[PDB]
């Protein structure tokens, strides 16, 4: 947050930091999706991978919950993606 | 003398600038962080295959390659962290070369996957040296053109000697 603030005392700096993190994350997520597009998804998730995902999500949620913090079309689409609401369009 | 070494430094900068477009590679995003991978040179490997690559040395003259950088205006007495950064850079270069030599075979299978050609024994070393030289160019960009005619620094020279001894021994160990 301080490194980003170097570029200014932006009003929504916390939201901005979260957005930048999630955007850098989505870049590599698009990379993975491109790598896997050709492959065929299954009707249901791989159970082992699903367990790993749940277990790691536990820790991720714990950390980001412990750290409490403080022009609409594309903005809201991307924000919905950030919040993982896959109903985004 | 060390003036010739300054000439060497300028020449390596200009010659890197030259070949990075004579052969249009500039894989300039990479560094010495760890062992390089063919995944970042696939096309560069294809272009390399267009030339016979046996005109390369098994060993690396880590000494002469890095000594020119040691010539800088350390007398400014403002950034000794610059000298410490140089020490870090040289040590990490030595580690990079040592790991490349130790796992040279592993890279050989990597580049067997990527462009399975007889010249791979030289392509591995060419990738190593070219990524290293891109890192050298980036380091030159980072530092300032404060090269003096002559400058003594016993500590840096000693670090160079001791690390490069390991580097040369490792490269020599590449038997065949």
């Amino acid at each position: 947050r301080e490194t980003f603030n170097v570029f200014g005392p932006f009003k929504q700096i916390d939201f901005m930091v979260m957005f930048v993190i999630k955007f850098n994350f989505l870049c590599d997520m698009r990379n993975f999706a491109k790598l896997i597009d050709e492959l065929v998804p299954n009707k249901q998730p791989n159970m082992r991978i699903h367990s790993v995902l749940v277990m790691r999500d536990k820790i991720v949620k714990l950390a980001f919950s412990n750290l409490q913090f403080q022009n609409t079309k594309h903005l809201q689409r991307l924000i919905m993606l950030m919040n993982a609401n896959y109903n985004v369009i | 003398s060390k003036d010739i070494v300054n000439e060497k430094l300028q020449k390596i900068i200009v010659v890197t600038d030259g070949m990075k477009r004579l052969y249009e590679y500039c894989n300039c995003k990479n560094s010495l962080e760890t062992l390089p991978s063919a995944a970042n040179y696939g096309s560069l490997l294809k272009r390399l295959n267009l030339y016979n690559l046996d005109h390369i040395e098994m060993n690396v003259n880590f000494y002469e390659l890095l000594f020119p950088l040691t010539l800088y205006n350390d007398n400014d007495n403002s950034d000794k962290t610059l000298s410490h950064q140089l020490v870090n850079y040289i040590f990490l270069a030595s580690n990079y070369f040592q790991n490349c030599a130790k796992n040279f075979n592993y890279m050989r299978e990597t580049f067997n996957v990527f462009g399975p050609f007889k010249q791979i024994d030289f392509m591995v070393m060419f990738v190593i040296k070219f990524n290293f030289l891109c890192d050298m160019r980036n380091f030159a960009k980072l530092i300032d053109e404060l090269v003096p005619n002559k400058q003594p620094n016993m500590r840096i020279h000693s670090v160079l000697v001791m690390r490069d001894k390991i580097v040369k021994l490792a490269f020599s160990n590449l038997q065949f």
Partner: protein, 283 residues
């Protein structure tokens, strides 16, 4: 007779597979060297002596916790200067025949290896050769059948639990370099799968994970991996560069004045590699 009809008795059992090695030449008496540890009912199915002799590995315990849980772990006996085949801590099914000198050791141990490693062709070859070698019928046949039955009993004890662990959801293990940004890790999980069920159990008992996520808490035992796995098998190699110095102080004045009774850090190199996950304690 004294005992109740049948009524399988209960006693201790030597657990290391190699304890069953005996000279097929009945006229030649032989005793295998077994460490007493073999008689501990634990996950180890190899005694310390055989482990060190054949795999270059030594057992070790890692306290874990409030309630101090003890996690089994093995450690390197590999020196710093060992190279090539010497670095194969546990050979794969495609290399054990070479790493282990079948010619130099006893036929019974060769059969044991061809059983552990799923080499049915070699097992059958040995069985037929023993059928047509020496006084097979008299006692050599019974000795061979006893050794084979013991090995098969151990393997049948291990493999079902190993498969259940493989498909298990609550307990998950991943033998690879947790530093995914590395090249010496590879498809460590695939190689572990290639290994036999009993071999997989041994690997689990020996190699501790770099990290361990219990429910919601994660413990990082290392910021690095002390061993790797490739096609050759379990390799005592540093994934990133120079080998770790292994003094091997045992087995195969002012300084002390200051350094009288004084806590000393061991120079041993334990086995840390991969990721492990568990729900609840299950202990």
């Amino acid at each position: 007779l004294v005992p109740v009809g049948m009524a399988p008795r209960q006693m201790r059992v030597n657990r290391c597979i190699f304890a069953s090695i005996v000279s097929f030449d009945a006229c030649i008496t032989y005793k295998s060297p077994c460490s007493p540890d073999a008689y501990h009912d634990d996950g180890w199915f190899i005694c310390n002596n055989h482990l060190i002799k054949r795999f270059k590995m030594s057992k070790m315990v890692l306290p874990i916790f409030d309630n101090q849980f003890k996690m089994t772990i093995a450690r390197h006996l590999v020196g710093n200067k060992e190279r090539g085949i010497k670095r194969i801590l546990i050979p794969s099914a495609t290399n054990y025949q070479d790493v282990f000198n079948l010619n130099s050791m006893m036929q019974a141990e060769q059969l044991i290896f061809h059983l552990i490693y799923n080499n049915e062709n070699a097992v059958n070859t040995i069985c037929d050769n023993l059928k047509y070698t020496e006084g097979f019928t008299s006692n050599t046949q019974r000795v061979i059948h006893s050794v084979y039955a013991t090995t098969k009993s151990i393997l049948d004890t291990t493999n079902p639990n190993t498969f259940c662990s493989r498909v298990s959801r609550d307990e998950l293990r991943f033998f690879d370099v947790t530093n995914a940004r590395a090249l010496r890790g590879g498809a460590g999980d695939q190689l572990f799968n290639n290994y036999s069920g009993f071999l997989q159990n041994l690997i689990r008992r020996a190699v501790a994970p770099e990290y361990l996520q219990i429910d919601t808490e994660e413990l990082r035992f290392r910021n690095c991996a002390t061993c790797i796995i490739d096609e050759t098998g379990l390799v005592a190699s540093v994934p990133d560069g120079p080998e770790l110095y292994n003094p091997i102080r045992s087995s195969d004045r002012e300084l002390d004045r200051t350094l009288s009774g004084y806590e000393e850090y061991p120079t041993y190199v334990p086995l840390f590699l991969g990721y492990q996950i568990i729900n609840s304690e299950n202990n």
